[PDB]
Amino acid sequence: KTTGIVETHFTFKDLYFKMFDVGAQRSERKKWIHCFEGVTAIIFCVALSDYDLVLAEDEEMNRMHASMKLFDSICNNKWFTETSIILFLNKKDLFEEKIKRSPLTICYPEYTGSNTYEEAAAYIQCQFEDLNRRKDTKEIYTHFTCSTDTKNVQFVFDAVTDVIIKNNLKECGLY
């Protein structure tokens, strides 16, 4: 019925999680971007299959470049200096299917090498993880989605636990 922020709630191993989806706002990001300060982690999603898809429909903008630009803008905000990012590279089946039909070299002028999933994934990831510059305070966790099993929830739970532990140690001053 209502538009705007959508909230989903679930409990995993006695931890209560809250997730806010802000994709329906369609307004200036800066005005509402200072309201979300204080979150524990930021979940970020990227599709590998957009390398050879002109999703944007603009010749100048390729979906991968747009995703990289958005990730760069989000990661280096003044407010989110100390919030970690859980990066989810998604759709690894179709991407692996199309690599041999059209290699990864279309997106980047530099060669990925070998035209196969392991090498291609490494090049796309390294290129996404190098966008950050506050390496001292924030870190990125990367998981390739697995549909059948529950690796998706467990990875988020473990990442949140690690973030909480590292936050407490830093406050004590030990870390």
């Binding site: 990831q125 390294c126 739970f157």
Partner: peptide, 7 residues
């Protein structure tokens, strides 16, 4: 058990 995939 939560570590980033090796770069």
């Amino acid at each position: 058990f939560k570590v980033a995939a090796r770069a």
